[PDB]
Amino acid sequence: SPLTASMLASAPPQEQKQMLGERLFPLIQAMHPTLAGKITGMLLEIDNSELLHMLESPESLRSKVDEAVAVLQAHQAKEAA
């Protein structure tokens, strides 16, 4: 049972984010098991239509996750110092 745009339309905005995160999380965790919760949280700031696109396009998701990891790691370097 895949997530569809009509499924999401049945839900309040905050629930839609959670629904999107549920589908994204296993994919993100596969790529980066340690950072997965934080990375998913970061991506959930993106508009829901764009998140749907990311769910449909592995290349798009991977580029965004790469961006998120690089940002998180750069931030961590600043805080670690």
Partner: peptide, 16 residues
């Protein structure tokens, strides 16, 4: 753009 201070996401399960 992406904010590294974003709320962490909590899944229904990790076996996801």
């Amino acid at each position: 753009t992406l904010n590294p201070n974003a709320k962490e996401f909590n899944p229904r399960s990790f076996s996801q």
